[PDB]
Every structure is written in structure tokens, then in C-alpha cells.
Amino acid sequence: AMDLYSPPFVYLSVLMASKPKEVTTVKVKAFIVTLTGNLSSSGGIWSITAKVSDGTAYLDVDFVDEILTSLIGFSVPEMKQSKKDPLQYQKFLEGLQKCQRDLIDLCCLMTISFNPSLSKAMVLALQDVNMEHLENLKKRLNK
Amino acid sequence: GGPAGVRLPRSPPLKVLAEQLRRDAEGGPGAWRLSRAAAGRGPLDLAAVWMQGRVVMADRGEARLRDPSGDFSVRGLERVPRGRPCLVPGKYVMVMGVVQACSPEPCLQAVKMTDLSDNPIHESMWELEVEDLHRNIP
């Protein structure tokens, strides 16, 4: 098997077979198969559940606040204050359109925090593939 | 097993190449599986697949794509989510799809298709990504 730190990313089926006892961070290339939830602002923060896949598994995830804020361009506080002015709320709505699109089109390296007792992970950060990633994959296949 | 209103294929979308489908796939519609008798391992399940390719042809919700290994065909694209629009010849995209036919030309029923043309590296990695992954399934 593969250590869970091997660049440029690992596989969710490998992580599962590891049988981790504790909460474990890995990185994987996934896309969203589907949402399982509407955008929420409960708790004063953004949340959304999804099923992703990296080709080896399916996995329930929630996006962290910081991701969804950067996709929309608005925090929960900013969104509420946007509701008090028509022009600013419009910019929020375009933010929302953009985000919903981003999610449809998302295909990248997700840094996921996986809780083994709960079958549920948290997506901490996203990153697009680059030349370095490519080399790493080259090297790891000895090619 | 989720929200009502989300029902997904049983096993995940395995990354593949047209050629592999064309040659190593076995069974028939609804019962597909990939042969790994070459590396002496067991059959893998082909409900869904993850392919990538350049668009050659686009006709409504049909399309013919091509990866380094060859041509593959897609239908029902009129029913999947529409992100950045990418049913244009020359775009590089990814499909998630359910295998309809394998040979002589692989046909998928699309569940998703997504643009990947705003970053060349996707194309460079596709063939290695496929191989790396097949190597990490026991």
C-alpha cells in the first residue's frame, strides 16, 4: 500500500483500508457527484453537504466556511447586511449563481479531514493541479 | 441511501480509457465489469465510469469525445448539470457516465460532464491518473 502522505494525492479506498482510529487529513483528486443539502447559514456560517468521488470511493463531505465564503464573495454577516440594500444584495445573488456553478464544475485536489467513526469528512481546502503535481505522479509510477 | 431524490450507481465512477473499455470490459448492459486477468487480479465493477477527452462532435445531447486511447460516445447530455458551457468541439472535459456499450465503440449515458479546458495540466495527467489508480486497487 501507499503511505497517506505520498504526493501528489492519495485514494479514498486506500485510506479506508488503513482503518484509521483517529481523525485523519489526506489529499485527493475528486469532483462532486451530487449535493445532499441546500446552502445553509445556520450557526452564522456557510455549510453544504455533498457526495464526492475520487474514482475509488464515494464520500459524504461538508465544505468549511472559508471555502464557501471565497466562492460566493460574501460571508454570512455580509450576506445579512446585503439584504438591507438592493444593489449589494444583487451582487450577493451573482455570488450565489457563481458558487452553484463552481460546485457543478469542481474537479480538483481537495484537502479532506476524515472522521472515521462518522463516515463523514470535512473539505478544508481546494487546489488546482500544476506541473509539480504531474512530476510527482510521474516519479511515483517510475516514469 | 441518502436524501430521497439522490440515487447513484452502486459502485463508484472508476477512471478509465476508451481502449480498456474496448478490450478488457466484460458482461453486457447493467452487468459490466473490467477484466484485470493481465495483472492476475480480480474483475472490477463497471457501473459508473470517469472518462476524460476532447470533444470531437456535439449534436444536441449526443457527443463523441476522444482520449489518447481512442474515441468514445456520450448520450443524454441534455439532462445533466450545466456548468461553464463545454459542449463545443475542441473543449477538454470530463464525463461521469454509466456504461451502455463497450465495443466496438464505448457508449455512456451521462450523469455529468464538466469543462477542464481552462487548465492544460488536466490533459497531461489524464493517462497517468488512470494508470496510478488502477495500480492502487487491490
Binding site: I32, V33, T34, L35, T36, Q100, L103, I104 | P3, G5, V6, R7, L8, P9, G76, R79, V80, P81, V98, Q109, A110, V111, K112
Partner: peptide
Amino acid sequence: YSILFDKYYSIPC
């Protein structure tokens, strides 16, 4: 098959 993004999308299965 069904998935949800901005809305539900349904796929012949």
C-alpha cells in the same frame, strides 16, 4: 439516477 445541484437532475437508469 438522480443528483442535485441548483436543482434535481434525473438520469435514465
